[PDB]
């Protein structure tokens, strides 16, 4: 009856995000799209033109149903801490209600309450560098847009959603086993994460009655991935080579576990690290 | 095609076999009782008069359709390894092909391949001594009963099972942290369990492209449950007092859980062990 | 023969860094300390008059031996991030060579190099409010001053370290399990810490042949530990009572660990998150 | 007064047992080996032989103090458990006292309470096997040998042990992450073994402030390792390899850490599995 869930976290149709949309999408869950200014523009534009048009068809007869597309960034809490740069850099200039507690006034106030909550976004200025040769600055980045944004979408969006409301983030294992090449403090921030996934568990299940839980996805080929200098290629192949289930990993597959946990069918799972990678985890060495 | 699904571990309506059953009669999934020999004519006894019909019903729309039950005891694999005892046994004498191979060998003879297998029993016959008065005997008969019947579910289910079929047992969090209460070899038969999950998912995904998982259940107050030290009237306590999520956790509630598990939607998930306990696993200590 | 260990965090001897102190003067092992500037004073004037003269003592005809006490702030890695305002502030004034590249050189110049090095300090500007909270502030915060200057103290060190050096640093549980009242993004800090502890691990074994290792320590009751708001009271009393070991928790049980570990006994462990908690962290309930 | 150390697991000098025989003697440690009949007397005739004298060298200093060495037999609890075949076995037949109550008492009756307790033995008749393959007979004889008889030393010798006293027994990371070759029920046999030990950490403690603890070590190529599906030269060079510390493991290594955890100086120590392998489990994938 009514269920809507806004998707923080899309730039295009290759990453998690979209494979979310998607799944959601076929449960007849209204989408809301969060998209970061300096990609919003070419993302609308791109919609507009009808570039995703084979990308939102679900199966036949059935195609993607978007209710709202917004633009918003997770590294600003209030309208109050945007500094004064980045109000009028060319790509924020234009756009407004874009911090998180705007975007969440702006969604209550169209649609009221939401039911679901999917933080699919991450960001790390020196990804590239090894954790030895990450600085203080690019490690604070990191836990700041990787990590906090998470503990921010919910002190926010709490307000603006109904009591047995589900919230999900995307994880990864070098959380917790090391992945040379995940570098810039992207497994310090993960890590933060899964244990902020803990102890925000706790507190909303006691006070709201909203779940919160994370899906560590196995490698999938998105633009972020790329970013990561190459890295992604090796790790697919890894994981289509050793994981028990050797298939390729799609964005659905995420997209499907995500619809489940937000759904009432996991009433009683909150604060857990769900792995979705086909078995790979499980796996201590190669054979 | 219809799905079929075996659940060896059915007694009453009280148990997590139940409502595993009423989550997969949502689907339309054919169930199949596998029934402890002790207990299959008490069982048959109160189904004809009429004992369960208020625990088969879904809602105005269908109930229960129970496609078979039939006589199970994990703990003999073949018909060769039952001993003279059991064999003169009362309750057993009147009963045939119950075996784990016998009853692989009779659900495909008469309903052909299945697709979805449920291991949902454990035993101990020293349960209510301490890990350390707890004899040989007794020790190797929880892990016989409750472990490995796991192991020897899935040999020989295997050749009446389609490729992407998928299997799920039971486990309890005492084979993490300690539970005092939970003795007789019990948590070390979970902790086998646990693994063992994980080395046959390797295996079955490999060789066969079959999921297994484990679901960690909270306190339910079961048949089973009733037998420890009360035990479980004290751990329902706690949970619903402390858990994150205070709410009564009902058998339904791990049954969606391995409704969803047993569904192709959880292609991409296997070798794990799902927490469905109102999220109690995370806490450190009570607040 | 001639080893050498710089213990980041020290105000008093209330603290661990003072038990670990304790236990590595009893092996033989010169001390050096680094001081936060901000009781820095405070402590050279203790020391002077004598005040930690009984702390100092270890059995009979034997007292703590301390090579160096040194101004150390792990806020700041270089002599060019220190702020201007920092660097005039009536406690910093007096002071120099205090950053994580200037200890590190002016330690060489003085001592050469080192082959033991120890992490024990930890901050939070927001610990006394819960996650949910926590400013994004706040939390950048805890991780910059908790998590990260183990990194950098680690990418400074290495170079006036010798092959087999180890490192030590302490964390706690809540970052695994929830604890009420470990506020500030300090659980966030933690999870962080014990997941760079992997990471660095494999850098600093492969690259130089140094091990990195974290104690996850049980409750003392420390400076900082009542800083927490009691807290710490409850905590000890929980430990005390429910832990497998019922006994007083000692800061020179965790430097006798601390001592085996940065000692050429525990060569073949790196990487590790080592419990020193009288077995608490093994509970699920009370009992 | 001096201490005592019983080891359990001995059969030659390259397997871990003798290991922890060294490192323990290194402090003055009385050491008694219990070692498995169907290789006793090959055992002492290559002894008196002065086959091992050179691995029982320490350095200029003393070598190896050996207090006694009996026959042991895990799978025997009392003279009532030993069936016909044993009894009528040709190397049993020359020996007595051998099961663990019978040991227990023995030592006890000549040496009077022991200090400390090493269980450095495991056992499955069907390793060879997968676990699939592994039948119930096979499964239950690799807890049997490998599980139980951790529980049953423990049961026996705390009446011949001090208060204080410290138990250690050794694991494989086979438990927790999936490993091909290690068939038969091992892995099994081996999670039970890590569960039991928190378990057995709760009662000792409680009841005789005894604490327990097990290691895992990483590859050494023993009699039992080169039994294995070669599994052990794939392992040893897999690990030297991806390893943080790429060295050579030795048996040595593990008997540091075993002599630490079996000292007062881990007194804050009991319920952990502590990782002895290099840093090999902490690694995600080959890099
Ligand atoms: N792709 C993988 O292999 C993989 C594996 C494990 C986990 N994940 C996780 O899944 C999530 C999605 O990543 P992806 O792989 O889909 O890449 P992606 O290309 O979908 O990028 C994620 C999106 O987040 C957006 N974003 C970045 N900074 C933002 C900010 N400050 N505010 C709002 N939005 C911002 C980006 O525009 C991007 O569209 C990430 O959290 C990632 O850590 C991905
Ligand atoms: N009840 C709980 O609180 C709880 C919590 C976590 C996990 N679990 C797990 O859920 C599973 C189901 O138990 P339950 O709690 O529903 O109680 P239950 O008694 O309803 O289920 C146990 C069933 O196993 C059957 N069984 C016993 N020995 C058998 C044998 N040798 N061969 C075949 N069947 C045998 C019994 O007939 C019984 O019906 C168990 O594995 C249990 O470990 C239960
Ligand atoms: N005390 C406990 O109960 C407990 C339990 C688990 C872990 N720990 C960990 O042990 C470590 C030591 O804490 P403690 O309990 O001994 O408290 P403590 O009173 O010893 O305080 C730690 C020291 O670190 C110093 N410090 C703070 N900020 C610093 C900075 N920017 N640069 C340099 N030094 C700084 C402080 O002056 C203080 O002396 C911490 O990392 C803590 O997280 C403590
Ligand atoms: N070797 C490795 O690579 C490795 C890695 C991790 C853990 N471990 C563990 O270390 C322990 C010691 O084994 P190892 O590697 O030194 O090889 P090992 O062969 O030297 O030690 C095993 C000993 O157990 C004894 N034993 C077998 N069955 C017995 C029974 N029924 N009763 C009494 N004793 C019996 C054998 O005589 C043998 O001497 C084992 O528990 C093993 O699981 C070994
Ligand atoms: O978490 C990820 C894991 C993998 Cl294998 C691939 C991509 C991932 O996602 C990211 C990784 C680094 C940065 Cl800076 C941003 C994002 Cl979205
Ligand atoms: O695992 C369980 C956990 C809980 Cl809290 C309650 C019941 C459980 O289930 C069992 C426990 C012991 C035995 Cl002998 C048999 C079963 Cl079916
Ligand atoms: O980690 C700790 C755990 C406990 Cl039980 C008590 C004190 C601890 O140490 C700290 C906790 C919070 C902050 Cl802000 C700083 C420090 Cl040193
Ligand atoms: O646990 C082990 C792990 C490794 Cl890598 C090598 C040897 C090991 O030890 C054993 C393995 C199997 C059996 Cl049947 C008996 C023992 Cl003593």
Same mark, same amino acid.
């Given at each position: 009856?009514?269920?809507?869930? *806004?998707?923080?976290?899309?730039?295009?149709?290759?990453?998690?995000?979209?494979?979310?949309? !998607?799944?959601?999408?076929?449960?007849?869950?209204?989408?809301?799209?969060?998209?970061?200014?300096?990609?919003?523009?070419? %993302?609308?534009?791109?919609?507009?033109?009808?570039?995703?048009?084979?990308?939102?068809?679900?199966?036949?007869?059935?195609?993607?149903?978007?209710? $709202?597309? /917004?633009?918003?960034?997770?590294?600003?809490?209030?309208?109050?801490?945007? $500094?004064?740069?980045?109000?009028?850099? !060319?790509?924020?200039?234009?756009?407004?209600?874009?911090?998180?507690?705007?975007?969440?006034?702006?969604?209550?106030?169209?649609?009221?309450?939401?039911?679901?909550?999917?933080?699919?976004?991450?960001?790390?200025?020196?990804?590239? !560098?090894?954790?030895?040769?990450? +600085?203080?600055?690019?490690?604070?980045?990191?836990?700041?847009?990787?990590?906090?944004?998470?503990?921010?979408?919910?002190?926010? *969006?709490?307000?603006?959603?109904? &009591?047995?409301? +589900?919230?999900?983030?995307?994880?990864?294992?070098?959380?917790?086993?090391?992945? &040379?090449?995940?570098?810039?403090?992207?497994?310090?921030?993960?890590?933060?994460?899964?244990?902020?996934?803990?102890?925000?568990?706790?507190?909303?299940?006691?006070?709201?009655?909203?779940?919160?839980?994370?899906?560590?996805?196995? &490698?999938?080929?998105?633009?972020?991935?790329?970013?990561?200098?190459?890295?992604? $290629?090796?790790?697919?192949?890894?994981?289509?080579?050793?994981?028990?289930?050797?298939?390729? /990993?799609?964005?659905?597959?995420?997209?499907?576990?995500?619809? %489940?946990?937000?759904?009432?069918?996991?009433?009683?799972?909150?604060?857990?690290?769900?792995?979705?990678?086909?078995?790979?985890?499980?796996? %201590?060495?190669?054979?």
């Amino acid at each position: 009856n009514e269920d809507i869930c *806004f998707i923080a976290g899309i730039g295009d149709t290759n990453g998690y995000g979209w494979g979310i949309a !998607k799944e959601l999408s076929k449960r007849n869950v209204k989408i809301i799209f969060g998209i970061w200014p300096p990609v919003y523009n070419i %993302f609308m534009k791109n919609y507009k033109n009808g570039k995703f048009d084979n990308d939102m068809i679900i199966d036949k007869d059935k195609k993607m149903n978007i209710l $709202d597309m /917004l633009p918003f960034d997770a590294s600003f809490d209030t309208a109050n801490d945007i $500094d004064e740069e980045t109000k009028n850099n !060319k790509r924020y200039n234009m756009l407004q209600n874009y911090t998180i507690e705007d975007v969440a006034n702006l969604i209550h106030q169209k649609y009221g309450k939401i039911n679901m909550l999917v933080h699919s976004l991450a960001n790390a200025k020196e990804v590239q !560098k090894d954790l030895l040769n990450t +600085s203080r600055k690019g490690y604070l980045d990191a836990l700041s847009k990787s990590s906090y944004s998470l503990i921010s979408l919910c002190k926010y *969006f709490v307000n603006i959603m109904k &009591p047995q409301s +589900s919230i999900i983030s995307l994880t990864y294992h070098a959380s917790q086993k090391v992945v &040379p090449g995940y570098g810039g403090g992207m497994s310090s921030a993960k890590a933060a994460l899964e244990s902020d996934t803990r102890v925000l568990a706790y507190h909303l299940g006691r006070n709201y009655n909203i779940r919160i839980n994370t899906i560590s996805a196995g &490698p999938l080929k998105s633009r972020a991935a790329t970013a990561i200098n190459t890295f992604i $290629d090796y790790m697919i192949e890894y994981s289509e080579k050793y994981a028990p289930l050797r298939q390729k /990993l799609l964005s659905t597959d995420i997209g499907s576990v995500a619809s %489940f946990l937000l759904s009432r069918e996991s009433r009683a799972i909150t604060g857990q690290t769900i792995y979705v990678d086909n078995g790979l985890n499980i796996m %201590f060495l190669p054979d």
